[PDB]
From TrEMBL, chains A, B:
Native organism: Haliangium ochraceum (strain DSM 14365 / JCM 11303 / SMP-2)
Superkingdom in the source lineage: Bacteria
Keyword Amino-acid biosynthesis assigned: no
Protein name as it appears in the record: DUF4159 domain-containing protein
Entry annotated with the keyword Signal: yes
Residues in DUF4159 domain copies: 5-199
Record keywords: Signal
Length: 200, 200
């Protein structure tokens, strides 16, 4: 069964990952484990979760060199990192930390964060999509890091996890802005596409 | 300018009332004050706000007799009370407190809480509506207290205020369940109808 590796660097939406797994199970033939694995970059078993997920809404420190190198190797040898900002606006403390992190993982002149083409196969890897919608729709594009056309890192500032967040009563908690429940569905599809792309 | 009297008995959605006023200003020719008045039932100037608003999500104590009588008189002499549950499910601690309050205000054999007819003019007092939607859609009906066909108290368990709640970035905060932004608009219309009914 597919299992997210939840990378913990500094739980905005308790149980959003579990909800992401449930959607992968309903929507696809992939069996997704309900409980993500909480992982750190110094974990000896980082490799057990090819798909890593990093969410946040504030600053986090650059990890130490062996951890940066563990991440670099994880990605170059076939893993995937989804970075998902919950900050609510673009270009805040989390964004600044993300950019510094990825500069450490892939120093120039290596490929760094660039805008992902709307023609990239990630946007048609399960659902047919156009842009990376989340709870928000601020950014019209996704950023990422490519290696030989393969997306190794996807960075979404539009808050995918917030679309999945639920209240104490089992309902969706947060509004998707501006396009509502239609947008929430497109966010769920974006997440499924990222997982199916990374796995296949 | 119309001004809500916010009745404070035990601020779930900071600034939801201000947002309600802004909607009355955009949507109608009524000038609505941005700041509601925080009022208590022992206030000598209770009468200055014919429209009272009571929201909550937990128990509150029955007010003392002079306060119960102040409310009784406020309503019988032409005022209006909107009671709006934010609890997230029906029939919780707030609901129990509401029912006890209204039993004190209007002892049997006086008319008490009853289901408001979908044909009542409140549902067509500005917008054409069918049912009292809020953030939620649990209850298919509105309850209220009538005097000679006039609605003096409206009680909505579907959380109107939660539809108006905004985040720190000026967007709608909470999901409307199950029917999304269409439902949010119907909630906003329900609030406008209640105000216009009470005023006209």
């Amino acid at each position: 069964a597919f299992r997210f590796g939840q990378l913990a660097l500094g739980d905005i939406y308790p149980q959003a990952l579990s909800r992401m797994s449930r959607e992968i199970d309903k929507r696809t033939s992939i069996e997704a484990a309900r409980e993500p694995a909480a992982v750190t970059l110094s974990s000896p078993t980082l490799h057990e979760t090819p798909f890593l997920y990093l969410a946040g809404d504030r600053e986090f420190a650059i990890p130490p060199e062996p951890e940066v190198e563990a991440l670099r190797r994880h990605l170059t040898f076939g893993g995937f990192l989804l970075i998902d900002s919950a900050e609510g606006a673009l270009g805040g403390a989390f964004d600044r930390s993300v950019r510094r992190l990825l500069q450490a993982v892939f120093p120039a002149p290596a490929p760094g964060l660039e805008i992902v083409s709307g023609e990239h196969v990630v946007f048609k890897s399960f659902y047919l999509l156009e842009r990376p919608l989340g709870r928000l729709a601020l950014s019209p594009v996704m950023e990422g890091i490519l290696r030989d056309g393969r997306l190794m890192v996807a960075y979404v500032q539009n808050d995918l996890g917030g679309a999945f967040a639920r209240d104490d009563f089992g309902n969706f908690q947060l509004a998707c802005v501006p396009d509502g429940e239609r947008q929430r569905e497109l966010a769920f599809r974006m997440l499924v596409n990222l997982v199916m792309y990374a796995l296949c």
